[PDB]
Amino acid sequence: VTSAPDTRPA
Amino acid sequence: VNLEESGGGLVQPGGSMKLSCVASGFTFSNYWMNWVRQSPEKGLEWVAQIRLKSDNYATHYAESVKGRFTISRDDSKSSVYLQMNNLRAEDTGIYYCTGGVFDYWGQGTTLTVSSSKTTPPSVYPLAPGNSMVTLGCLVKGYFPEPVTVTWNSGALSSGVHTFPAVLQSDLYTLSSSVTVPSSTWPSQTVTCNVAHPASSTKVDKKIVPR
Amino acid sequence: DVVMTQTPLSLPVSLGDQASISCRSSQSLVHSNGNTYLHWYLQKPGQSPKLLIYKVSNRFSGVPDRFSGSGSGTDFTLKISRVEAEDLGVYFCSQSTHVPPWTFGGGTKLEIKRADAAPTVSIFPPSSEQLTSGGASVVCFLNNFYPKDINVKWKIDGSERQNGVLNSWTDQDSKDSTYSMSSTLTLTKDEYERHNSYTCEATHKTSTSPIVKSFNRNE
Ligand SMILES: *[C@H]1O[C@H](CO)[C@H](O)[C@H](O)[C@H]1NC(C)=O
């Protein structure tokens, strides 16, 4: 419940 | 939920160590798993992360441990591992296994990196020279931390106080007290059990009258 | 790296009152998805941390209804209403938004304000086993007192001795919101066997008179 989705811009 | 760690103790500088963690009570295979260490100097510090099968077991490491530590997981054993090479003094601390960031925590195991030798404790009974009597155990001269103290193998707990260890002249000292009804002692025995995982030593000392 | 800052270092609250603990971040913790990944933990004495609140305000499993979290951006607060003694410990915040690394606050200790209590004092002479190794520790337990402030003097045959004294305090006890302390005077056997009377004197707010316990080698 504590994990956020990663953001990964090129 | 339970996570139980193993490994640790005293490691010489430059040496290696493998911590292990076994988990139960949550769907282990769908959680990112992590190691977090705790020290007076740095507080709580996230160390390493391993992700899922789906993620091809992607990993992240803290700057202070990258290239020396390897995290891995065994979904068939509900286990996570931390392999540590070229350990430094700064790696000393309590290591927790965790699920999520940070949903579930283990109980912690302690790692000390120093060029010292391991020294098991000397355990000394504290008996007195009312309706209650206070007894104790003095634990001297051990290294590294920690020791754990129980009384009557954990069967006495309500009247127990255990004091944090203090490091003097390169060796630790701590004490524990237990308070029980005076009618019941010595007729019903009272024993302190002192465990020192790092030296693989436990001492059981019955408190007998002087 | 997001820096997490926690205040106060220690918080005194009466049972049944409300406590508020603050957590600041060096940057806003709002994530692209609009969620805010700020979480609260409680580390009770001698235990590992346990998750209390996730994403600012959601109670985790088994968390009583007196815990609530609030805040936004860089400024967050945990409120513990109707405080119970079992709520004492170190409260941490952590952030999962800007990662790696996942980062933690430095912790806030919740101290329960209870009624003054005088220490129960017990003194213990050296064991025979310790004497055969050439050492001689006299141990004084000062149990179940409040507030934490206390002073211990050791006297040997009437004169105060400061060298060789090791003091150690427990964390607050959840059963009765008291503290306990151990004071140990370690001598060599050689010096111990040259003196007769060993006294620990505890001075605490609860009385202008010290609480004195004494052991005489003429046992
Ligand atoms: C992506 O955005 C999130 C916040 O939504 C985090 O800041 C993360 O660090 C970002 N990733 C990069 C490369 O900037």
Side-chain angles (χ1 to χ4, degrees), chain A residues 5-9, chain C residues 30-33 97-100:
Chain A
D6 301 287
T7 56
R8 298 170 181 183
Chain C
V30 187
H31 190 277
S32 302
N33 68 10
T97 296
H98 309 290
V99 299

Coordinates of all heavy atoms in Angstrom, one line a residue, chain A residues 5-9, chain C residues 30-33 97-100, ligand 1:
Chain A
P5 N 3.9 4.1 -8.1 CA 4.4 3.8 -9.5 C 5.5 4.6 -9.9 O 5.5 5.9 -9.7 CB 3.2 3.9 -10.4 CG 2.3 4.9 -9.7 CD 2.6 4.8 -8.2
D6 N 6.6 4.0 -10.4 CA 7.7 4.8 -10.9 C 7.4 5.6 -12.1 O 6.6 5.3 -13.0 CB 8.9 3.8 -11.2 CG 9.3 3.0 -10.0 OD1 9.9 3.5 -9.1 OD2 8.9 1.8 -10.0
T7 N 8.1 6.8 -12.2 CA 8.1 7.7 -13.3 C 9.4 7.6 -14.0 O 10.5 7.6 -13.4 CB 7.7 9.1 -12.9 OG1 8.7 9.5 -11.9 CG2 6.3 9.2 -12.3
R8 N 9.4 7.5 -15.3 CA 10.6 7.1 -16.1 C 10.6 7.9 -17.4 O 10.3 7.3 -18.5 CB 10.7 5.6 -16.3 CG 10.8 4.8 -15.0 CD 10.7 3.3 -15.2 NE 10.8 2.7 -13.9 CZ 10.8 1.3 -13.8 NH1 10.7 0.5 -14.8 NH2 10.8 0.8 -12.6
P9 N 10.9 9.2 -17.4 CA 10.9 10.0 -18.6 C 12.1 9.7 -19.5 O 13.3 9.6 -19.0 CB 10.9 11.4 -18.1 CG 11.6 11.3 -16.8 CD 11.2 10.0 -16.2
Chain C
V30 N 3.7 15.3 -3.4 CA 2.6 14.9 -4.3 C 3.3 14.2 -5.5 O 4.3 14.7 -6.1 CB 1.8 16.1 -4.8 CG1 0.6 15.6 -5.6 CG2 1.3 16.8 -3.5
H31 N 2.8 13.1 -5.9 CA 3.2 12.3 -7.1 C 2.5 12.7 -8.3 O 1.4 13.3 -8.2 CB 3.0 10.8 -6.7 CG 3.6 9.8 -7.7 ND1 3.0 9.5 -8.9 CD2 4.7 9.1 -7.6 CE1 3.8 8.6 -9.5 NE2 4.8 8.3 -8.8
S32 N 3.0 12.3 -9.5 CA 2.4 12.6 -10.7 C 0.9 12.1 -10.7 O 0.0 12.7 -11.3 CB 3.1 12.0 -11.9 OG 4.5 12.4 -11.9
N33 N 0.6 10.9 -10.1 CA -0.7 10.4 -10.1 C -1.6 11.1 -9.2 O -2.8 10.6 -9.0 CB -0.7 8.9 -9.8 CG -0.2 8.5 -8.4 OD1 -0.1 9.4 -7.5 ND2 0.0 7.3 -8.1
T97 N 7.6 8.9 -2.7 CA 7.2 9.6 -3.9 C 8.4 9.8 -4.8 O 8.3 9.4 -6.0 CB 6.5 10.9 -3.6 OG1 5.3 10.7 -2.9 CG2 6.2 11.7 -4.9
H98 N 9.5 10.4 -4.3 CA 10.7 10.7 -5.1 C 11.8 9.7 -4.7 O 12.5 9.9 -3.7 CB 11.1 12.2 -4.9 CG 10.0 13.1 -5.0 ND1 9.4 13.4 -6.3 CD2 9.2 13.8 -4.1 CE1 8.4 14.3 -6.1 NE2 8.3 14.6 -4.9
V99 N 12.0 8.7 -5.5 CA 12.8 7.5 -5.1 C 13.4 7.0 -6.4 O 12.9 7.2 -7.5 CB 11.9 6.5 -4.4 CG1 11.3 7.0 -3.2 CG2 10.8 6.0 -5.4
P100 N 14.5 6.2 -6.3 CA 15.2 6.1 -5.0 C 16.0 7.3 -4.7 O 16.2 8.2 -5.6 CB 16.2 4.9 -5.3 CG 16.5 5.2 -6.8 CD 15.1 5.5 -7.4
Ligands
LIG1 C1 9.1 10.8 -11.8 O1 8.2 11.5 -11.0 C2 8.0 11.1 -9.7 C3 7.0 12.0 -9.0 O2 5.8 11.7 -9.6 C4 9.4 11.1 -9.0 O3 9.8 12.5 -8.8 C5 10.5 10.5 -9.8 O4 11.7 10.7 -9.2 C6 10.5 11.0 -11.2 N1 11.5 10.4 -12.0 C7 12.5 11.2 -12.7 C8 13.5 10.6 -13.6 O5 12.5 12.4 -12.6

